Amino acid sequence: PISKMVTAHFVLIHTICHGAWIWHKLKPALERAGHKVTALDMAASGIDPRQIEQINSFDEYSEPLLTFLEKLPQGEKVIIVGESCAGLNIAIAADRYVDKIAAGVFHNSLLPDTVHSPSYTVEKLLESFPDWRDTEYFTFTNITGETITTMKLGFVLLRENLFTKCTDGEYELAKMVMRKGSLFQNVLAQRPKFTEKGYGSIKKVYIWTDQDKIFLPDFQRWQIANYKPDKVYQVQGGDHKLQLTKTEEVAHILQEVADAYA
Amino acid sequence: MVTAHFVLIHTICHGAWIWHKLKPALERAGHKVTALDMAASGIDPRQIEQINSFDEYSEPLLTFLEKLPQGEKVIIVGESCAGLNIAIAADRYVDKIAAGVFHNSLLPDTVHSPSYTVEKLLESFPDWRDTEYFTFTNITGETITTMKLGFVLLRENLFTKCTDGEYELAKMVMRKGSLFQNVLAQRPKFTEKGYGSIKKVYIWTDQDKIFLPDFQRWQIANYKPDKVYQVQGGDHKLQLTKTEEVAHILQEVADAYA
Amino acid sequence: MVTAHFVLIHTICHGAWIWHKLKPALERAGHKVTALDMAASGIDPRQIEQINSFDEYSEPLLTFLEKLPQGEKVIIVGESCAGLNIAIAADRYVDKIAAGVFHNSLLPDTVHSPSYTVEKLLESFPDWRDTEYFTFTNITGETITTMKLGFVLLRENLFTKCTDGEYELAKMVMRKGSLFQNVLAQRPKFTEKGYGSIKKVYIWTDQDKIFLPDFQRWQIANYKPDKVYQVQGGDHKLQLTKTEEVAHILQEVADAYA
Amino acid sequence: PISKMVTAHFVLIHTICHGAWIWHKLKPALERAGHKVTALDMAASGIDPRQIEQINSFDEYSEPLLTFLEKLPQGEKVIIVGESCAGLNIAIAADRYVDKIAAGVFHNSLLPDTVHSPSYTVEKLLESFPDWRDTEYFTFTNITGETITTMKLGFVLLRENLFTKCTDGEYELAKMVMRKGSLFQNVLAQRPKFTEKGYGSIKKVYIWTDQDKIFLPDFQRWQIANYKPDKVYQVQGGDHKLQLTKTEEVAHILQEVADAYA
């Protein structure tokens, strides 16, 4: 009757251990569409110079995103796309910059809620996927004395669970730049719950595939059931890294998110 | 009397070496002594430009404490700026710490910023004479200021009453350091459950020529410790000019906090 | 045909990651591939300001070679500036090296200074466009210049014919680097018994937009390698634009030097 | 008839693993006498920022001394006092700056000659003292492919052989600042012999004690017999570190060296 098409500024947020680099295919696809894209490295991830043992909470880990949202021009708003654990980064950011966030898009991601603790969906993912195969674990003591568990994701788990259907060049790239990470799960468990005013009010779009071999269909569906997203988009096929295995599709869904919310 | 395990922590620019007289003294009373070099200090191989905060500078201490066998507890003795290393360490490992001892040291608190006593000492002692300053940008973009302590400042202010062989030792191994003051100003305050919990003993001499009597008395009035031992005479480096006196006070702290 | 173990060495500012297409290609032919990050490159945790020479920058390669089991030999493939890493490594471990392969790379020699080809390339290509430069003083007092490669230089000169996802990858993980040119100018020349001994294969394309045809031809004429393979088309990053072509040439080198 | 007293500029050179710090007592003693003293850290020793794995020869190790001799004012000459392995540093320096060296003083030190290889007295010391007790050894490959052996001196060997009679505060200090070192013996063995024109012409004063428990009396005497020093001073008592156990005595002998050669 009247059709709308919008260009948007997407801020792409990687999961722990990874960096801005998993978005190297989705970032140009979105830009071919005319969108402005920002792909940030979070603390101690990608080529960020900090090491994980200096980070003391998932909030400290999210600093590159909050500084960037802090820096945004007045009246400029963004769509934050977060993969896997970055749903926690979108929740931490929306309770500070609700003002600047047009929509949060969860891409095979943790979908936090306001009702339960911040660690809640982490707990449920681990119930659902408890064996991380050849992942190695380590600990350090943080600034207030918490023991923080870090991990180096195993290469079979990378191969088979996260990068199941990705190109050899993509899987090899992952092995070349992957770093330690931390869920900071015990510190998230002591954290205040996300607020309804910030996080609770953000538009929320859930993209997922039932072919994901680490965020399994029964965890994903549980998340949608536990905290109804404003929109759900299921991508047929692909694997956990839909921004590599379904780059154009994810880009088209993101155009639709722009049209609706941006 | 009670033997204890002491972890001695030098101040910025210095190294485990300022404890070369006090470590044998304590060991002659049966104590176990660990004297660590903090990052970029003593013979630690790192340079100050790769250290980005005072919590990173504390790493040798936090790794040691991370590895103390379960159920062992130590008495951390810190000189001058090392009261900040006690506070950083006590927040992370409060249950491994039998007591913190401040030897002519900054005594941080829980109500003001981590940099609060750095701010107050520089107000008491704003002219560090021939000290030279430098800056680098740390990995998150802050400009850290480093210093190279001046030898007149070393001779007259810190090592005032020290032997010529001690003063000469100091000039031969002193390295650059930093207060990371602006990063401390941004740092979360020290917690009550960690640093606030620790038993605290403050040792000083009114003959210190850089942590001057009224600043030290201010600190004591700002955050009353459990015990204050005042040594007569000496200079800022009581572990060199009053070694046995400190060894004796440290015995009273082992006795009292096991 | 003959399988081999290749050690792939990235150029300054880059990381093991530029070999993400060539490492699987080679492995599909049964080769063993090691792709290392040099100091302060890729995800190596060091920063460029703690590296004080190109020999220190080579450390990841020299430690690997130090640890190769006795009697194993590798083919080192180095791109662009990494011909200096081959030469440094070949002088120390000549007997562990079956052949050095120079992929649009500096081909150092034994009669002129280590910096000689850095000098000649900068004469051929003096304007690095939007590259930014910085300096630090190294531990012995030299001023090292570091650079941050410019993205137009990346798009047009190095990654000319590269995919958009490859170019974008590059901007996402590129880090600072240094030629340590002045330190190389002071460095002892590469030895005949080490670097001079090694078998040498030179791979290039005349469509390189930064190691330009006449500089590459100059290098070949300055120090004739054993074999020169010229790939048609591509750009400076043949391991991304002509991956299979390089994988094939590398097979000929395994065949020939085991 | 006419008596002479001279003030001199002494450059004090530590042995491998150690630094300028073992001279912290002799340097002020010499200065009480009015002498100018310079105590240098050699590469990767004391607080020199270099690590031993970047040093490729004993010549590279001696760089702080050669740069300092390079920097000396015209017509200024120095007396170089070298303890233990620093006799090799005096030999390397005299073949470059014979011009600037009034005398070389060997202080419980290796006394190189011109007749044999540079490694010769190292070989003979190891024949004489072959077991370094709790010393740990390591290797790295140098710039031209040589494997270099490094060591961390054991604390019993420190206690009993090197610091036998030193103060507890001195022995503890040693443990607090001691670093790895290398004899670079295989690279000294391929090195050109020291020249007669440089090293061979320097005045040479040998200070030693027969109480030394690592450079033993029969090695010391052999050295004196193998290459006659211009003067020999035996200090009764003390231990290997005579600059700590006989500081004033060593200082008086050095005053006599100044009077004779400086």
PDB file of N, CA and C in Angstrom, chain B residues 51-102:
ATOM      1  N   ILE B  51      52.947  -2.951  31.337  1.00  0.00           N
ATOM      2  CA  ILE B  51      52.094  -3.155  32.493  1.00  0.00           C
ATOM      3  C   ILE B  51      51.014  -2.096  32.375  1.00  0.00           C
ATOM      4  N   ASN B  52      49.717  -2.426  32.444  1.00  0.00           N
ATOM      5  CA  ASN B  52      48.718  -1.392  32.202  1.00  0.00           C
ATOM      6  C   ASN B  52      47.922  -0.968  33.399  1.00  0.00           C
ATOM      7  N   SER B  53      48.157  -1.540  34.589  1.00  0.00           N
ATOM      8  CA  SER B  53      47.479  -1.091  35.778  1.00  0.00           C
ATOM      9  C   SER B  53      48.272  -1.642  36.908  1.00  0.00           C
ATOM     10  N   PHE B  54      47.948  -1.086  38.074  1.00  0.00           N
ATOM     11  CA  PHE B  54      48.545  -1.521  39.336  1.00  0.00           C
ATOM     12  C   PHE B  54      48.088  -2.946  39.650  1.00  0.00           C
ATOM     13  N   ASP B  55      46.903  -3.358  39.253  1.00  0.00           N
ATOM     14  CA  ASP B  55      46.517  -4.745  39.446  1.00  0.00           C
ATOM     15  C   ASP B  55      47.387  -5.603  38.559  1.00  0.00           C
ATOM     16  N   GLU B  56      47.773  -5.235  37.340  1.00  0.00           N
ATOM     17  CA  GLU B  56      48.689  -6.058  36.571  1.00  0.00           C
ATOM     18  C   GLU B  56      50.068  -6.055  37.166  1.00  0.00           C
ATOM     19  N   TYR B  57      50.525  -4.921  37.690  1.00  0.00           N
ATOM     20  CA  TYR B  57      51.818  -4.838  38.350  1.00  0.00           C
ATOM     21  C   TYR B  57      51.872  -5.827  39.515  1.00  0.00           C
ATOM     22  N   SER B  58      50.750  -6.094  40.208  1.00  0.00           N
ATOM     23  CA  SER B  58      50.668  -7.011  41.329  1.00  0.00           C
ATOM     24  C   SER B  58      50.717  -8.467  40.950  1.00  0.00           C
ATOM     25  N   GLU B  59      50.825  -8.772  39.665  1.00  0.00           N
ATOM     26  CA  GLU B  59      50.652 -10.135  39.229  1.00  0.00           C
ATOM     27  C   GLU B  59      51.550 -11.096  39.951  1.00  0.00           C
ATOM     28  N   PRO B  60      52.861 -10.916  40.149  1.00  0.00           N
ATOM     29  CA  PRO B  60      53.688 -11.871  40.857  1.00  0.00           C
ATOM     30  C   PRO B  60      53.114 -12.235  42.206  1.00  0.00           C
ATOM     31  N   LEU B  61      52.509 -11.265  42.885  1.00  0.00           N
ATOM     32  CA  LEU B  61      51.888 -11.546  44.171  1.00  0.00           C
ATOM     33  C   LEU B  61      50.591 -12.331  44.019  1.00  0.00           C
ATOM     34  N   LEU B  62      49.751 -11.993  43.072  1.00  0.00           N
ATOM     35  CA  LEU B  62      48.506 -12.693  42.926  1.00  0.00           C
ATOM     36  C   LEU B  62      48.705 -14.135  42.452  1.00  0.00           C
ATOM     37  N   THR B  63      49.730 -14.444  41.622  1.00  0.00           N
ATOM     38  CA  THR B  63      50.026 -15.787  41.164  1.00  0.00           C
ATOM     39  C   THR B  63      50.517 -16.584  42.345  1.00  0.00           C
ATOM     40  N   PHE B  64      51.399 -16.049  43.168  1.00  0.00           N
ATOM     41  CA  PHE B  64      51.882 -16.723  44.363  1.00  0.00           C
ATOM     42  C   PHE B  64      50.702 -17.086  45.246  1.00  0.00           C
ATOM     43  N   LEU B  65      49.870 -16.104  45.564  1.00  0.00           N
ATOM     44  CA  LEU B  65      48.715 -16.355  46.393  1.00  0.00           C
ATOM     45  C   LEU B  65      47.779 -17.338  45.721  1.00  0.00           C
ATOM     46  N   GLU B  66      47.588 -17.271  44.412  1.00  0.00           N
ATOM     47  CA  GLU B  66      46.768 -18.196  43.688  1.00  0.00           C
ATOM     48  C   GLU B  66      47.276 -19.593  43.946  1.00  0.00           C
ATOM     49  N   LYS B  67      48.591 -19.767  44.019  1.00  0.00           N
ATOM     50  CA  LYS B  67      49.150 -21.081  44.219  1.00  0.00           C
ATOM     51  C   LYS B  67      49.421 -21.449  45.659  1.00  0.00           C
ATOM     52  N   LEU B  68      49.252 -20.634  46.692  1.00  0.00           N
ATOM     53  CA  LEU B  68      49.484 -21.079  48.060  1.00  0.00           C
ATOM     54  C   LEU B  68      48.637 -22.298  48.294  1.00  0.00           C
ATOM     55  N   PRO B  69      49.185 -23.359  48.865  1.00  0.00           N
ATOM     56  CA  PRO B  69      48.418 -24.531  49.230  1.00  0.00           C
ATOM     57  C   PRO B  69      47.310 -24.155  50.175  1.00  0.00           C
ATOM     58  N   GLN B  70      46.255 -24.895  49.877  1.00  0.00           N
ATOM     59  CA  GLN B  70      45.031 -24.751  50.617  1.00  0.00           C
ATOM     60  C   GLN B  70      45.304 -24.957  52.109  1.00  0.00           C
ATOM     61  N   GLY B  71      44.763 -23.919  52.722  1.00  0.00           N
ATOM     62  CA  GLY B  71      44.850 -23.787  54.148  1.00  0.00           C
ATOM     63  C   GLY B  71      46.105 -23.066  54.608  1.00  0.00           C
ATOM     64  N   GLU B  72      47.077 -22.691  53.784  1.00  0.00           N
ATOM     65  CA  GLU B  72      48.218 -21.947  54.262  1.00  0.00           C
ATOM     66  C   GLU B  72      47.805 -20.490  54.191  1.00  0.00           C
ATOM     67  N   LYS B  73      48.294 -19.663  55.101  1.00  0.00           N
ATOM     68  CA  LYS B  73      47.970 -18.237  55.168  1.00  0.00           C
ATOM     69  C   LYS B  73      49.283 -17.525  55.364  1.00  0.00           C
ATOM     70  N   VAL B  74      49.416 -16.321  54.799  1.00  0.00           N
ATOM     71  CA  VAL B  74      50.652 -15.563  54.887  1.00  0.00           C
ATOM     72  C   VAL B  74      50.457 -14.197  55.513  1.00  0.00           C
ATOM     73  N   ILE B  75      51.549 -13.586  55.961  1.00  0.00           N
ATOM     74  CA  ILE B  75      51.499 -12.225  56.434  1.00  0.00           C
ATOM     75  C   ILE B  75      52.171 -11.434  55.314  1.00  0.00           C
ATOM     76  N   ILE B  76      51.475 -10.526  54.623  1.00  0.00           N
ATOM     77  CA  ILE B  76      52.064  -9.755  53.517  1.00  0.00           C
ATOM     78  C   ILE B  76      52.616  -8.465  54.186  1.00  0.00           C
ATOM     79  N   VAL B  77      53.915  -8.168  53.994  1.00  0.00           N
ATOM     80  CA  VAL B  77      54.554  -6.961  54.471  1.00  0.00           C
ATOM     81  C   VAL B  77      54.852  -6.118  53.249  1.00  0.00           C
ATOM     82  N   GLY B  78      54.357  -4.895  53.148  1.00  0.00           N
ATOM     83  CA  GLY B  78      54.538  -4.100  51.949  1.00  0.00           C
ATOM     84  C   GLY B  78      55.136  -2.775  52.329  1.00  0.00           C
ATOM     85  N   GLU B  79      56.116  -2.288  51.590  1.00  0.00           N
ATOM     86  CA  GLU B  79      56.683  -0.991  51.919  1.00  0.00           C
ATOM     87  C   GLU B  79      56.233   0.071  50.919  1.00  0.00           C
ATOM     88  N   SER B  80      56.075   1.302  51.430  1.00  0.00           N
ATOM     89  CA  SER B  80      55.738   2.510  50.688  1.00  0.00           C
ATOM     90  C   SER B  80      54.529   2.388  49.762  1.00  0.00           C
ATOM     91  N   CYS B  81      54.641   2.280  48.453  1.00  0.00           N
ATOM     92  CA  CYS B  81      53.460   2.142  47.642  1.00  0.00           C
ATOM     93  C   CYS B  81      52.889   0.764  47.783  1.00  0.00           C
ATOM     94  N   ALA B  82      53.566  -0.243  48.355  1.00  0.00           N
ATOM     95  CA  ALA B  82      53.048  -1.601  48.325  1.00  0.00           C
ATOM     96  C   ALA B  82      51.829  -1.807  49.167  1.00  0.00           C
ATOM     97  N   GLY B  83      51.340  -0.836  49.935  1.00  0.00           N
ATOM     98  CA  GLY B  83      50.085  -0.964  50.639  1.00  0.00           C
ATOM     99  C   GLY B  83      48.990  -1.118  49.604  1.00  0.00           C
ATOM    100  N   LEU B  84      49.154  -0.626  48.385  1.00  0.00           N
ATOM    101  CA  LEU B  84      48.163  -0.864  47.336  1.00  0.00           C
ATOM    102  C   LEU B  84      48.203  -2.303  46.860  1.00  0.00           C
ATOM    103  N   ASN B  85      49.361  -2.958  46.868  1.00  0.00           N
ATOM    104  CA  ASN B  85      49.468  -4.346  46.461  1.00  0.00           C
ATOM    105  C   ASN B  85      48.789  -5.195  47.522  1.00  0.00           C
ATOM    106  N   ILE B  86      48.944  -4.892  48.834  1.00  0.00           N
ATOM    107  CA  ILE B  86      48.213  -5.625  49.872  1.00  0.00           C
ATOM    108  C   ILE B  86      46.697  -5.559  49.656  1.00  0.00           C
ATOM    109  N   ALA B  87      46.176  -4.362  49.407  1.00  0.00           N
ATOM    110  CA  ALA B  87      44.764  -4.136  49.198  1.00  0.00           C
ATOM    111  C   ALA B  87      44.210  -4.846  47.971  1.00  0.00           C
ATOM    112  N   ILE B  88      44.937  -4.848  46.838  1.00  0.00           N
ATOM    113  CA  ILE B  88      44.539  -5.560  45.636  1.00  0.00           C
ATOM    114  C   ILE B  88      44.523  -7.072  45.928  1.00  0.00           C
ATOM    115  N   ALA B  89      45.537  -7.561  46.645  1.00  0.00           N
ATOM    116  CA  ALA B  89      45.692  -8.967  46.903  1.00  0.00           C
ATOM    117  C   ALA B  89      44.683  -9.446  47.916  1.00  0.00           C
ATOM    118  N   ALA B  90      44.370  -8.636  48.928  1.00  0.00           N
ATOM    119  CA  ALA B  90      43.431  -8.975  49.988  1.00  0.00           C
ATOM    120  C   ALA B  90      42.016  -9.053  49.484  1.00  0.00           C
ATOM    121  N   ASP B  91      41.645  -8.262  48.480  1.00  0.00           N
ATOM    122  CA  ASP B  91      40.355  -8.415  47.876  1.00  0.00           C
ATOM    123  C   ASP B  91      40.163  -9.662  47.105  1.00  0.00           C
ATOM    124  N   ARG B  92      41.233 -10.243  46.579  1.00  0.00           N
ATOM    125  CA  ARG B  92      41.129 -11.450  45.804  1.00  0.00           C
ATOM    126  C   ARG B  92      41.301 -12.699  46.624  1.00  0.00           C
ATOM    127  N   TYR B  93      42.153 -12.664  47.652  1.00  0.00           N
ATOM    128  CA  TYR B  93      42.545 -13.817  48.469  1.00  0.00           C
ATOM    129  C   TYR B  93      42.393 -13.588  49.967  1.00  0.00           C
ATOM    130  N   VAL B  94      41.356 -12.911  50.459  1.00  0.00           N
ATOM    131  CA  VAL B  94      41.287 -12.604  51.880  1.00  0.00           C
ATOM    132  C   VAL B  94      41.490 -13.772  52.842  1.00  0.00           C
ATOM    133  N   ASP B  95      41.104 -14.943  52.393  1.00  0.00           N
ATOM    134  CA  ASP B  95      41.264 -16.062  53.277  1.00  0.00           C
ATOM    135  C   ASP B  95      42.617 -16.690  53.327  1.00  0.00           C
ATOM    136  N   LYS B  96      43.562 -16.183  52.558  1.00  0.00           N
ATOM    137  CA  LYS B  96      44.902 -16.689  52.531  1.00  0.00           C
ATOM    138  C   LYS B  96      45.760 -15.737  53.311  1.00  0.00           C
ATOM    139  N   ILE B  97      45.168 -14.660  53.814  1.00  0.00           N
ATOM    140  CA  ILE B  97      45.957 -13.623  54.415  1.00  0.00           C
ATOM    141  C   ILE B  97      45.734 -13.503  55.913  1.00  0.00           C
ATOM    142  N   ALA B  98      46.758 -13.849  56.701  1.00  0.00           N
ATOM    143  CA  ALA B  98      46.663 -13.751  58.146  1.00  0.00           C
ATOM    144  C   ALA B  98      46.725 -12.282  58.603  1.00  0.00           C
ATOM    145  N   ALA B  99      47.469 -11.383  57.938  1.00  0.00           N
ATOM    146  CA  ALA B  99      47.486  -9.972  58.262  1.00  0.00           C
ATOM    147  C   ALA B  99      48.286  -9.214  57.220  1.00  0.00           C
ATOM    148  N   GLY B 100      47.990  -7.940  56.993  1.00  0.00           N
ATOM    149  CA  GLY B 100      48.778  -7.127  56.090  1.00  0.00           C
ATOM    150  C   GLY B 100      49.629  -6.203  56.970  1.00  0.00           C
ATOM    151  N   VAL B 101      50.926  -5.987  56.696  1.00  0.00           N
ATOM    152  CA  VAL B 101      51.751  -5.072  57.476  1.00  0.00           C
ATOM    153  C   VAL B 101      52.239  -3.982  56.535  1.00  0.00           C
ATOM    154  N   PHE B 102      52.079  -2.723  56.940  1.00  0.00           N
ATOM    155  CA  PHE B 102      52.352  -1.538  56.126  1.00  0.00           C
ATOM    156  C   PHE B 102      53.598  -0.959  56.756  1.00  0.00           C
TER     157      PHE B 102
END
